[PDB]
Design a protein around this nucleic acid. Structure first.
Ligand SMILES: [Mg+2]
Lengths: 51, 51
RNA sequence: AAGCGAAACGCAGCAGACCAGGC
């Protein structure tokens, strides 16, 4: 985690909880083999006009 | 001078023809949305009224 | 001058032989 002026505004327990959640999400996603797809980003394609 | 029976003689099919000619080269959705009105008016039914 | 509905995202090498060829 990185915070402006190195001021995270929160106690270490709250940030540790949020990081844990993020990790849990990471492992849950990796278990289904979708992490590599998510890795690549910059998704921006649209075509729908009017039908 | 005015034109006698103006509304009684302006056929909606003529407006459909004019809309189709005006909307030449335009996107098909634009032609459809513009031409729907004359189509419905050509099939219009007049309610007789109070009685 | 004009005027209308007045979030989040640019790889990588063997190396060392031996042969043929170039001016
Ligand atoms: Mg030479």
């Amino acid at each position: 985690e990185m915070a402006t002026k190195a001021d995270y505004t929160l106690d270490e327990e709250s940030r540790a909880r949020i990081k844990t959640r993020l990790f849990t999400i990471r492992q849950e996603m990796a278990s289904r083999g979708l992490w590599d797809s998510f890795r690549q980003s910059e998704r921006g394609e649209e075509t729908i006009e009017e039908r | 001078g005015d034109n006698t029976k103006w509304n009684e003689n302006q056929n909606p099919r003529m407006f459909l023809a004019m809309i189709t000619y005006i909307t030449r080269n335009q996107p098909e959705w634009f032609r459809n949305v513009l031409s729907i009105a004359p189509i419905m008016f050509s099939n219009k039914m007049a309610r007789l009224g109070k009685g």
